[PDB]
Amino acid sequence: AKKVQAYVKLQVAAGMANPSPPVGPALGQQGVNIMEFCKAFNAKTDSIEKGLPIPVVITVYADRSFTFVTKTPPAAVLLKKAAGIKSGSGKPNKDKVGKISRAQLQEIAQTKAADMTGADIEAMTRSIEGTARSMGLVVED
Amino acid sequence: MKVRASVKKLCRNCKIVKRDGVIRVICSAEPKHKQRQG
Amino acid sequence: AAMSGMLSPELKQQIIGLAEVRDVFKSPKFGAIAGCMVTEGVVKRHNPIRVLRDNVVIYEGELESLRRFKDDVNEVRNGMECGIGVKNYNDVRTGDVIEVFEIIEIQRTIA
Amino acid sequence: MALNLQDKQAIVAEVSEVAKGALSAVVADSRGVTVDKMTELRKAGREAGVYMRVVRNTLLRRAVEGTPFECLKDAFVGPTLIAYSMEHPGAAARLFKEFAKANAKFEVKAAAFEGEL
Amino acid sequence: MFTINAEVRKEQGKGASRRLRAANKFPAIIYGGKEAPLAIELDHDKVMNMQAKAEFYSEVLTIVVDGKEIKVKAQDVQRHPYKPKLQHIDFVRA
Amino acid sequence: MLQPKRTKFRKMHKGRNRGLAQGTDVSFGSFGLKAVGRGRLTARQIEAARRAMTRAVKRQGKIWIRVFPDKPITEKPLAVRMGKGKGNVEYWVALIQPGKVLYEMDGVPEELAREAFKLAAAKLPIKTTFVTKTVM
RNA sequence: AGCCAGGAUGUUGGCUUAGAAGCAGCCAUCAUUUAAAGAAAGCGUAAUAGCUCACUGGUCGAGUCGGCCUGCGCGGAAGAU
Ligand SMILES: [Mg+2]
Ligand SMILES: [Mg+2]
Ligand SMILES: [Zn+2]
């Protein structure tokens, strides 16, 4: 990574064997190889975990095929499986549906430590406190 | 450009400087905001 | 072009004048004559009217006779005493206001 | 902009570390991107961020007012932009080499390497 | 903590009071206790900035006039209806 | 809209607008709107000025009305001659003096309240000015 | 006030949506990294992107910014022999 020119990002599903519902022909106008998907991308996809959203970073100009660099998982997904109800609410922040404990969002947010600016490990917990304040979920420290 | 009467500063690029006996409104970014007669 | 012409759209129903009626009078022909005072605009003969009481429309119609005194003028301006009567309108009550409006057609284009 | 009382927070923190300081190193952050600053931040990720600096006291009426107590090398350091850093631990070990070896990428400006104690 | 530099009014009445408003002054009076009331004139430009603070109406003030220092408190302030101006201020000894 | 429900007498003659206003300060609200000029204010103006203040800051904040017309103000027809009695009652008017607080405001911020009174100022026929809490 | 840089990570904040990622709305508007950065003042996109402001650094350098009460003016101000 040196200068911004051409990149694409979108979350794909690893639950099926070689799927492309989101992209297909609409992966990229630059001429990204469809055959290279099963050869390259599926090597490290099934090796880690399946089910969650998996983003992508593509940089191709005259190389045809390519390789990929490691990524970081989002925080909004960690408020689904490792928190309360998965469907949603509908009502605004005025009414509070769910709740959070001190045990939650401490070692769960530790999985994001691959790529973060935050130096201190105790500071990572306080960053998620503000995130839950959007929905308005009460937490008992 | 309009004339109307009041200048009314809309954007940060609004100028409002007097020319001859009749003040004008000059805006380089948005030519629609050009006005006279204030 | 043939298609564009086919269209018949009138997009304006702007009021021509608005008048309040007071001190009803009786007439043999129309059954009633409602004395009026135009507060705004100009009242016309063949232009349609909307009779409403307390913001809701009690009755609707098109004027048949616009008559002030024995003059029976076809037009009445605002703030000039005026007179009105219409067929098929039974009950005249004070405090209601009659809204007259002209009808115009904008015209249409194909695209 | 902060008033005189709040300005003394940056001064007294620097003045107390003049006698107790060990090593300092400088670099021109002018013309530079936040991603170029993030190299020194991810360098401090092993050391936890509290030990390291590059925290800009670079005004000549802030840090250069706290210089005249002891160890004056800031006579000709004044002009242009300077990155002040003070550490209670620290050796005269490899810590210079990361700034020197980074000059393959150019690093925008190095201030012509003025040098500090 | 407030020092009001003032003078004793030579003239009185409606004709006298309107002449003071032309010269940026305004009429006042210091009354209360066993002492008789005395009509005092205050400067508009100095006084008008002080009552913006809440401490003017609560804390005690000292009107300096001919080396007296009566030490009085604010009671009732008449303002000009359609402008930001002061007509007359009542004072009470304490 | 905004007229007397019942009246002791149907018509007032004419009257004069002289002297200064009563309420120099705002009794109920924190901020408000004071009228500097002198003139006749119809019941349609204060209705139109209230409609601007009705939808400005949505839900938060409350407004008061310190004025009321209570003056019949008759109007003659056009082509009618002079005399033949006095005209019928058409629209109501509030005569106000300089220094009268027309409108008030409490649960709105200071800078946001200046915008609301600026819109209502253009609706009125005379010049207006902002006022503070002014406790004493 | 110019000139010379940054103007962010978590995070597409939650929610409403075909899609609104700071910028059509609603409520909350904090916490890390921080020289400094508002979960966002404006332009822009179908929506991202892009480019600025606030804030702050370098350079230069001593008066600068925004209101209140007034003296006297400017526009608003077009008619027929
Ligand atoms: Mg010219
Ligand atoms: Mg003029
Ligand atoms: Zn403009």
XYZ file of C-alpha atoms (C1' of nucleotides) and ligand atoms in Angstrom:
721
model
C 0.000 0.000 0.000
C 1.537 3.308 -1.238
C -1.055 5.500 -3.079
C -4.850 5.464 -3.574
C -5.947 4.563 -7.148
C -8.268 1.517 -7.461
C -9.834 -0.535 -4.627
C -13.146 -2.312 -3.862
C -14.661 -3.514 -0.546
C -17.738 -5.678 0.188
C -18.652 -8.333 2.782
C -19.007 -11.915 1.407
C -20.367 -15.166 2.907
C -18.096 -18.229 3.393
C -20.932 -20.658 4.367
C -21.209 -22.232 0.872
C -18.694 -23.906 -1.497
C -17.385 -21.215 -3.918
C -20.297 -18.691 -3.669
C -20.737 -15.378 -5.492
C -24.257 -13.952 -4.836
C -23.085 -10.360 -3.985
C -20.624 -9.783 -6.902
C -20.488 -12.324 -9.798
C -19.691 -10.232 -12.923
C -20.003 -7.062 -10.722
C -16.788 -7.780 -8.693
C -14.796 -5.217 -10.713
C -14.784 -3.346 -14.046
C -10.926 -3.493 -14.155
C -10.990 -7.213 -15.180
C -10.558 -9.246 -11.988
C -10.005 -12.994 -12.546
C -13.003 -15.160 -11.522
C -10.921 -18.397 -11.691
C -8.414 -16.916 -9.165
C -11.185 -16.646 -6.475
C -11.269 -20.421 -5.779
C -7.448 -20.699 -6.116
C -6.397 -17.747 -3.891
C -9.242 -16.385 -1.690
C -10.670 -19.772 -0.548
C -7.243 -20.885 0.853
C -7.338 -18.622 3.959
C -11.182 -18.199 4.100
C -12.056 -21.725 5.313
C -8.825 -21.949 7.397
C -9.987 -19.317 9.995
C -13.826 -19.169 10.444
C -17.114 -19.140 8.445
C -20.511 -17.399 8.844
C -19.427 -13.834 9.730
C -18.959 -10.926 7.231
C -15.607 -11.172 5.372
C -14.473 -7.933 3.589
C -11.927 -7.717 0.711
C -9.114 -5.493 -0.673
C -8.255 -5.859 -4.403
C -5.311 -4.075 -6.109
C -4.745 -5.197 -9.744
C -3.487 -3.135 -12.742
C -1.505 -5.405 -15.137
C -0.942 -8.514 -12.918
C -4.190 -10.400 -13.878
C -4.023 -12.724 -10.815
C -3.223 -11.520 -7.271
C -2.622 -12.224 -3.569
C -4.264 -10.637 -0.478
C -3.189 -9.125 2.875
C -4.747 -9.742 6.345
C -7.825 -7.821 7.592
C -9.566 -6.767 10.864
C -13.089 -7.812 12.050
C -15.728 -5.079 12.704
C -17.280 -4.140 16.087
C -20.930 -3.984 14.873
C -20.867 -7.767 14.158
C -19.576 -8.425 17.730
C -22.846 -6.811 19.005
C -24.861 -9.694 17.352
C -23.549 -13.134 18.461
C -21.757 -11.965 21.646
C -24.606 -9.616 22.805
C -28.463 -9.668 23.157
C -31.141 -10.023 20.445
C -29.952 -10.402 16.813
C -33.039 -9.136 14.891
C -33.104 -5.504 16.104
C -35.486 -3.060 17.821
C -37.205 -0.485 15.550
C -37.804 2.046 18.353
C -35.349 4.989 18.843
C -32.757 5.522 21.626
C -35.585 6.939 23.879
C -36.606 3.357 24.836
C -33.974 0.787 25.954
C -34.630 -2.842 24.889
C -31.379 -4.708 25.675
C -28.634 -4.661 28.323
C -24.883 -5.404 28.652
C -22.708 -6.945 31.421
C -19.107 -6.204 32.492
C -17.944 -9.700 31.388
C -19.182 -8.976 27.832
C -17.188 -6.621 25.540
C -13.889 -7.115 27.489
C -12.272 -10.304 26.077
C -14.649 -10.260 23.044
C -13.226 -6.884 21.868
C -9.676 -8.316 22.429
C -10.053 -10.186 19.069
C -9.867 -6.752 17.312
C -6.238 -6.203 18.576
C -4.726 -7.133 15.130
C -5.089 -3.596 13.664
C -5.877 -0.795 16.169
C -4.341 2.595 17.054
C -5.095 2.139 20.800
C -1.962 1.223 22.788
C -3.375 0.252 26.209
C -5.415 -2.969 26.671
C -7.610 -1.396 29.420
C -8.346 1.495 26.985
C -9.920 -0.991 24.489
C -12.815 -1.649 26.933
C -13.592 2.099 27.319
C -13.825 2.550 23.501
C -16.672 -0.045 23.341
C -18.588 1.809 26.157
C -19.147 4.726 23.753
C -20.188 2.301 20.965
C -22.999 0.820 23.126
C -24.163 4.388 24.038
C -25.435 4.783 20.413
C -28.037 2.044 20.959
C -28.135 3.136 24.643
C -27.387 -0.252 26.218
C -26.831 0.074 29.986
C -23.638 -1.531 31.395
C -22.915 -2.228 35.096
C -19.193 -1.818 35.890
C -27.900 37.418 -11.490
C -30.875 38.584 -9.388
C -31.390 42.063 -7.867
C -34.096 41.755 -5.123
C -32.894 44.092 -2.240
C -31.242 42.368 0.782
C -27.802 40.765 0.168
C -28.132 37.783 2.611
C -24.784 35.950 3.150
C -25.409 32.241 2.376
C -22.035 30.440 2.052
C -18.502 31.080 3.377
C -17.454 32.190 -0.169
C -19.789 35.275 -0.013
C -17.912 38.595 -0.362
C -20.172 41.703 -0.049
C -17.995 44.675 -1.162
C -19.255 48.031 -2.534
C -18.756 48.958 -6.221
C -19.516 52.509 -7.473
C -22.807 53.684 -5.766
C -24.563 50.262 -5.603
C -23.221 47.333 -3.484
C -22.901 43.883 -5.121
C -22.705 40.253 -3.982
C -19.773 38.247 -5.424
C -19.451 34.449 -5.041
C -16.784 32.571 -7.055
C -17.843 29.033 -6.010
C -21.591 29.539 -6.701
C -22.532 31.959 -9.574
C -26.255 31.565 -8.595
C -25.600 33.660 -5.427
C -24.550 36.754 -7.500
C -26.743 39.800 -6.683
C -27.003 43.617 -6.940
C -29.035 46.566 -5.604
C -28.546 46.641 -1.821
C -46.868 15.401 -31.272
C -50.212 13.774 -31.901
C -49.916 12.133 -28.505
C -48.839 15.267 -26.637
C -51.849 17.160 -27.905
C -54.200 14.389 -26.835
C -53.512 15.355 -23.220
C -55.951 17.622 -21.393
C -54.397 18.818 -18.152
C -55.444 21.862 -16.133
C -53.069 22.338 -13.204
C -54.507 25.508 -11.687
C -57.497 25.811 -9.370
C -56.464 29.131 -7.855
C -59.214 31.111 -6.147
C -60.450 34.123 -8.070
C -62.067 35.647 -5.025
C -63.208 34.780 -1.514
C -66.403 36.240 -0.061
C -68.407 35.971 3.165
C -72.218 36.082 3.035
C -74.495 37.896 5.465
C -78.173 38.834 5.837
C -79.808 36.289 3.511
C -82.647 37.414 1.228
C -85.439 35.403 -0.402
C -85.904 35.025 -4.161
C -88.604 33.135 -6.087
C -86.300 31.819 -8.827
C -83.227 30.557 -6.956
C -84.987 30.181 -3.614
C -82.390 32.286 -1.815
C -80.154 35.328 -2.209
C -77.194 35.531 0.155
C -75.956 39.062 0.685
C -72.177 39.088 0.489
C -69.095 41.194 1.146
C -65.990 40.337 -0.809
C -62.931 40.390 1.399
C -60.439 39.469 -1.326
C -60.198 39.130 -5.102
C -62.854 39.567 -7.775
C -66.040 37.501 -8.015
C -67.067 36.301 -11.483
C -70.177 34.765 -13.041
C -69.388 31.435 -14.711
C -66.434 30.518 -12.484
C -67.052 27.619 -10.043
C -67.419 28.153 -6.287
C -66.810 26.203 -3.088
C -69.152 26.912 -0.160
C -67.630 26.011 3.199
C -68.539 26.499 6.852
C -66.042 26.068 9.688
C -63.252 25.020 7.299
C -65.320 22.089 5.986
C -67.274 22.333 2.733
C -71.014 22.394 3.317
C -71.816 22.660 -0.396
C -70.276 22.982 -3.862
C -71.367 24.466 -7.187
C -71.012 26.982 -10.013
C -72.623 30.430 -9.876
C -75.756 31.014 -11.938
C -76.579 34.599 -10.987
C -74.332 37.327 -9.598
C -76.467 40.365 -8.815
C -75.910 43.505 -6.777
C -79.044 45.605 -6.334
C -80.960 45.634 -9.638
C -77.728 46.065 -11.608
C -76.933 42.344 -11.974
C -73.275 42.998 -12.817
C -71.163 40.041 -13.967
C -68.195 41.068 -11.812
C -67.729 42.269 -8.227
C -64.436 43.453 -6.729
C -63.277 43.163 -3.119
C -64.632 45.410 -0.375
C -67.639 46.290 -2.496
C -71.093 45.196 -1.380
C -72.154 42.162 -3.397
C -75.062 39.763 -3.821
C -75.242 36.076 -4.733
C -77.719 33.284 -5.357
C -77.529 29.712 -6.645
C -79.904 26.856 -7.426
C -79.958 23.661 -5.333
C -78.710 25.376 -2.177
C -81.284 25.205 0.616
C -79.751 26.621 3.780
C -77.974 29.962 4.076
C -76.225 30.615 7.384
C -74.107 33.596 8.426
C -70.413 33.238 9.230
C -69.589 30.837 6.411
C -67.398 31.927 3.503
C -67.776 31.169 -0.207
C -64.602 30.513 -2.193
C -64.726 31.210 -5.926
C -61.880 29.880 -8.066
C -60.960 30.043 -11.739
C -60.067 26.924 -13.699
C -57.075 26.851 -16.036
C -55.249 24.152 -17.975
C -51.455 23.883 -17.880
C -51.237 21.637 -20.986
C -49.068 18.553 -21.521
C -45.949 17.336 -23.326
C -44.746 13.805 -24.096
C -41.526 12.434 -22.601
C -6.064 28.393 22.685
C -5.395 27.946 26.433
C -4.658 30.675 29.034
C -1.471 31.000 31.197
C -2.510 28.534 33.965
C -3.418 25.757 31.479
C -0.237 26.472 29.423
C 1.927 25.589 32.495
C 0.785 21.902 32.260
C 3.079 21.383 29.223
C 5.893 23.504 30.787
C 6.138 21.940 34.291
C 5.952 18.406 32.789
C 9.010 19.264 30.613
C 10.952 21.321 33.242
C 10.924 18.486 35.848
C 12.399 16.054 33.233
C 15.473 18.249 32.362
C 17.670 16.954 35.222
C 16.060 13.466 35.185
C 16.190 13.059 31.345
C 18.368 10.504 29.507
C 18.069 10.721 25.680
C 16.362 12.870 23.003
C 15.857 12.560 19.209
C 14.480 15.010 16.588
C 12.629 14.863 13.238
C 10.739 17.256 10.902
C 6.992 16.451 11.049
C 6.308 19.337 8.571
C 4.849 18.316 5.161
C 3.978 14.908 6.755
C 0.879 12.667 6.734
C -0.836 11.072 9.799
C 0.144 7.635 8.338
C 3.828 8.756 8.568
C 3.190 9.632 12.258
C 1.581 6.161 12.755
C 5.010 4.498 12.110
C 6.306 5.913 15.430
C 2.971 4.985 17.119
C 3.202 1.294 16.051
C 6.893 1.418 17.117
C 5.619 2.427 20.606
C 2.993 -0.414 20.585
C 5.590 -2.832 22.016
C 6.546 -0.197 24.658
C 2.793 0.595 25.338
C 2.805 4.273 24.140
C 3.285 5.984 27.550
C 7.129 5.787 27.511
C 7.554 7.307 24.007
C 6.866 10.868 22.799
C 7.079 13.057 19.639
C 4.474 15.080 21.658
C 4.870 18.552 20.147
C 6.190 21.140 22.594
C 7.807 22.675 19.470
C 6.868 26.349 20.139
C 9.886 28.582 20.904
C 7.839 30.169 23.731
C 7.118 26.794 25.463
C 9.962 24.180 25.304
C 12.805 26.663 24.600
C 11.645 28.585 27.748
C 12.183 25.339 29.759
C 15.640 24.677 28.180
C 17.851 27.269 30.087
C 17.962 25.278 33.404
C 20.553 22.634 32.335
C 21.974 20.943 29.186
C 21.620 23.661 26.508
C 21.972 22.309 22.953
C 18.974 24.372 21.667
C 20.833 27.544 20.537
C 20.830 26.698 16.795
C 18.024 24.055 17.090
C 15.390 26.883 17.256
C 14.611 27.548 13.539
C 12.183 25.299 11.565
C 10.166 22.430 13.218
C 11.680 20.253 16.012
C 10.280 17.069 17.660
C 11.111 17.088 21.405
C 11.262 13.810 23.391
C 12.407 13.031 26.977
C 12.697 9.609 28.698
C 13.554 8.657 32.322
C 14.846 5.191 31.276
C 16.673 4.498 27.977
C 20.170 3.600 26.722
C 22.377 4.872 23.857
C 21.481 1.689 21.936
C 19.785 0.934 18.528
C 16.893 3.513 18.901
C 18.608 5.922 16.418
C 18.741 3.238 13.653
C 14.941 3.021 13.023
C 14.896 6.706 11.946
C 18.088 6.252 9.843
C 17.017 2.978 8.138
C 13.582 4.509 7.314
C 15.322 6.994 4.903
C 14.883 4.436 2.055
C 11.243 5.694 1.896
C 12.459 9.394 2.192
C 10.356 10.210 5.334
C 9.347 13.644 3.916
C 11.905 15.747 5.900
C 14.545 14.663 8.470
C 15.507 18.283 9.461
C 19.028 17.540 8.041
C 19.798 15.590 11.298
C 20.608 18.357 13.824
C 21.098 15.915 16.731
C 20.490 15.967 20.510
C 21.894 14.464 23.741
C -17.005 45.503 46.495
C -18.629 48.076 44.108
C -17.635 51.788 44.132
C -20.126 54.285 42.592
C -18.655 57.788 42.078
C -21.567 60.278 42.291
C -22.553 63.879 43.168
C -25.386 65.610 45.067
C -28.179 66.980 42.828
C -28.421 70.798 42.849
C -31.698 70.908 40.848
C -34.804 68.660 40.975
C -38.077 67.873 39.134
C -39.053 66.689 35.628
C -37.332 69.595 33.825
C -34.090 68.929 35.742
C -34.141 65.121 35.249
C -34.521 65.221 31.427
C -31.431 67.502 31.164
C -29.380 64.789 32.971
C -30.333 62.117 30.367
C -28.953 64.416 27.613
C -25.600 64.502 29.516
C -25.544 60.649 29.997
C -26.622 60.890 33.690
C -29.786 59.720 35.495
C -31.604 60.554 38.782
C -31.571 58.352 41.917
C -32.289 58.449 45.689
C -30.752 57.031 48.908
C -33.357 56.531 51.689
C -34.081 54.273 54.709
C -33.393 54.275 58.452
C -33.571 57.408 60.632
C -31.733 59.636 58.072
C -33.640 61.835 55.582
C -33.736 60.899 51.840
C -31.185 62.561 49.490
C -31.400 62.814 45.671
C -28.175 61.577 43.975
C -27.133 61.589 40.262
C -25.298 58.587 38.708
C -23.368 58.294 35.403
C -25.029 56.038 32.778
C -21.930 54.631 30.995
C -20.284 53.358 34.226
C -23.425 52.003 35.970
C -25.194 50.323 32.962
C -22.469 47.619 32.619
C -22.632 46.609 36.334
C -26.242 45.321 36.710
C -25.653 42.754 33.887
C -23.934 40.669 36.605
C -26.186 38.977 39.204
C -23.948 40.232 42.087
C -25.198 43.867 41.689
C -28.704 43.081 43.050
C -27.505 40.660 45.821
C -24.201 42.003 47.248
C -23.865 45.325 49.120
C -22.457 48.347 47.200
C -20.772 51.587 48.375
C -21.850 54.894 46.758
C -18.896 57.317 47.087
C -20.170 60.942 47.138
C -18.201 63.853 48.730
C -16.288 61.453 51.051
C -19.345 59.829 52.684
C -19.663 56.127 51.704
C -23.259 55.432 52.821
C -23.118 51.678 51.911
C -26.557 50.849 50.420
C -28.444 48.060 48.577
C -30.531 47.993 45.368
C -34.341 47.988 45.860
C -36.215 48.962 42.652
C -34.842 49.826 39.168
C -37.017 51.670 36.611
C -35.843 51.073 33.010
C -36.707 53.032 29.843
C -39.446 50.945 28.103
C -38.330 50.802 24.412
C -34.484 51.118 24.800
C -31.659 49.582 26.912
C -31.497 52.529 29.372
C -32.062 53.287 33.087
C -34.617 55.875 34.319
C -34.340 55.746 38.126
C -32.869 53.401 40.790
C -34.035 53.241 44.436
C -31.454 52.593 47.207
C -31.938 51.424 50.836
C -29.447 51.911 53.716
C -28.060 48.750 55.390
C -58.889 33.817 14.039
C -58.148 34.807 17.672
C -61.091 37.124 18.493
C -63.448 37.781 21.469
C -66.009 35.004 22.143
C -68.539 37.483 23.575
C -68.559 41.309 23.614
C -70.259 43.769 26.005
C -70.553 46.210 23.075
C -70.233 45.501 19.337
C -68.383 48.662 18.156
C -65.552 50.928 19.372
C -65.378 54.376 17.714
C -61.713 54.984 16.758
C -59.408 55.718 19.723
C -55.849 57.056 19.962
C -52.463 55.363 20.527
C -50.612 57.573 23.053
C -48.160 57.207 25.955
C -45.790 54.349 26.841
C -46.390 50.615 27.413
C -47.079 48.807 30.716
C -44.822 45.735 30.978
C -41.166 46.794 30.714
C -39.938 43.288 31.774
C -40.766 39.650 30.927
C -42.727 38.161 33.864
C -43.240 34.509 32.814
C -40.588 33.600 30.206
C -36.773 33.754 30.074
C -36.560 35.612 26.720
C -39.056 37.471 24.508
C -39.911 40.025 21.811
C -40.482 43.759 22.467
C -41.954 46.292 19.986
C -39.943 49.532 19.548
C -42.267 51.323 17.072
C -45.874 52.558 17.325
C -48.886 51.485 15.219
C -51.953 49.274 14.703
C -51.458 45.463 14.723
C -54.295 43.365 13.192
C -55.350 39.905 14.468
C -54.138 38.291 11.192
C -50.549 39.544 11.815
C -50.204 38.004 15.301
C -51.827 34.810 13.902
C -49.248 34.786 11.054
C -46.377 35.590 13.475
C -47.527 32.780 15.824
C -47.597 30.316 12.859
C -43.853 30.985 12.318
C -43.206 30.297 16.040
C -45.545 27.223 16.025
C -43.119 25.262 13.805
C -39.551 26.538 14.371
C -37.931 24.528 17.228
C -40.486 21.617 16.969
C -41.488 20.242 20.449
C -39.075 21.778 22.998
C -39.774 25.335 24.221
C -43.037 27.132 25.059
C -44.483 30.463 23.817
C -46.856 32.954 25.503
C -49.158 35.666 24.112
C -49.145 38.872 26.232
C -51.384 40.851 23.772
C -54.976 40.673 22.493
C -57.023 42.765 19.988
C -60.418 43.462 21.753
C -61.023 46.408 19.319
C -63.881 45.910 16.747
C -62.493 48.208 13.960
C -65.325 48.545 11.416
C -64.852 48.893 7.632
C -67.259 50.467 5.104
C -68.139 49.070 1.652
C -66.598 50.456 -1.565
C -69.388 51.987 -3.698
C -71.565 53.014 -0.687
C -71.897 56.741 0.132
C -70.800 58.330 3.428
C -73.241 58.251 6.350
C -76.119 55.727 6.559
C -74.788 54.546 9.947
C -71.419 53.013 10.848
C -69.910 50.035 8.978
C -69.926 46.369 10.048
C -67.156 44.671 12.070
C -64.563 42.982 9.786
C -61.165 42.381 11.494
C -59.779 42.826 15.041
C -56.748 45.016 15.966
C -54.367 45.279 18.964
C -53.152 48.855 19.608
C -49.723 48.675 21.322
C -47.255 51.260 22.693
C -43.407 51.377 22.615
C -41.873 49.048 25.247
C -44.666 46.415 25.124
C -43.502 42.770 25.224
C -45.568 40.971 22.539
C -44.112 37.428 22.687
C -42.115 35.302 25.162
C -39.895 32.174 25.161
C -38.416 29.894 27.884
C -37.281 26.381 26.823
C -35.178 27.363 23.769
C -31.422 28.282 23.697
C -30.309 31.938 23.351
C -28.793 31.758 19.835
C -31.652 29.561 18.507
C -34.241 31.993 19.995
C -32.773 34.922 17.959
C -33.690 33.107 14.700
C -37.325 32.520 15.823
C -37.892 36.192 16.789
C -36.176 37.390 13.550
C -38.812 35.523 11.469
C -41.694 36.885 13.607
C -40.219 40.443 13.371
C -40.767 40.600 9.572
C -44.463 39.618 10.012
C -45.176 42.692 12.207
C -45.633 46.224 10.709
C -43.319 48.038 13.211
C -39.709 47.646 14.407
C -38.987 45.099 17.177
C -36.129 44.250 19.575
C -34.801 41.373 21.723
C -35.030 41.383 25.557
C -33.225 39.522 28.385
C -34.711 37.915 31.560
C -34.325 41.237 33.505
C -35.260 40.030 37.029
C -35.261 43.546 38.577
C -5.381 37.124 7.949
C -2.062 34.622 3.949
C 1.645 31.008 2.653
C 3.422 25.829 4.050
C 1.167 20.257 6.483
C -2.104 17.232 8.938
C -7.427 17.115 9.158
C -7.644 10.349 11.780
C -8.425 4.917 13.864
C -12.241 1.818 16.068
C -16.796 3.121 12.796
C -20.847 1.760 6.954
C -22.124 5.111 15.203
C -27.252 3.273 16.231
C -31.925 3.546 13.702
C -34.983 4.414 9.305
C -34.013 2.744 3.861
C -33.486 -0.113 -2.784
C -29.018 2.472 -1.265
C -27.885 7.627 2.641
C -20.807 5.205 4.761
C -20.198 12.770 8.983
C -23.449 15.532 5.593
C -32.883 13.589 3.465
C -34.656 12.828 8.959
C -35.184 10.969 14.475
C -32.568 10.227 19.393
C -27.662 9.992 21.682
C -23.588 13.428 20.575
C -19.102 10.259 24.001
C -14.388 7.215 24.277
C -9.225 5.854 22.286
C -4.953 7.345 19.302
C -3.915 12.358 20.187
C 0.533 18.192 18.107
C -4.816 18.420 16.811
C -9.755 16.220 14.588
C -16.852 17.865 15.667
C -19.366 9.955 15.800
C -19.418 16.364 12.034
C -20.387 23.428 9.513
C -20.712 23.416 3.907
C -19.952 21.608 -1.356
C -20.297 16.756 -3.907
C -22.121 11.160 -5.104
C -27.847 6.691 -6.793
C -24.833 5.598 -2.306
C -18.987 5.213 -1.324
C -14.866 8.048 -3.009
C -13.010 13.309 -3.570
C -12.054 18.380 -1.828
C -12.512 22.111 2.434
C -13.793 24.363 7.429
C -13.430 24.098 12.968
C -9.169 22.456 16.044
C -3.772 22.400 15.965
C 1.908 22.698 13.944
C 5.713 25.565 10.923
C 6.726 30.372 8.697
C 6.006 35.536 9.179
C 4.751 39.191 12.653
C 1.816 43.678 16.696
C -2.366 45.138 17.021
C -6.643 41.891 15.942
C -12.116 39.800 16.108
C -17.345 40.300 17.046
C -21.480 43.036 19.306
C -24.211 47.301 21.863
C -26.009 53.074 22.033
C -25.700 57.082 18.452
C -23.882 61.736 14.370
C -24.710 62.166 8.995
C -24.986 59.433 4.399
C -25.755 54.708 0.368
C -29.387 51.447 -2.152
C -34.539 50.329 -1.881
C -36.511 55.445 -5.501
C -40.381 54.066 -12.479
C -44.647 58.642 -15.900
C -46.515 60.846 -19.459
C -45.603 68.816 -23.739
Mg -20.168 50.915 -13.071
Mg -32.662 57.135 1.256
Zn -22.366 33.497 -1.726
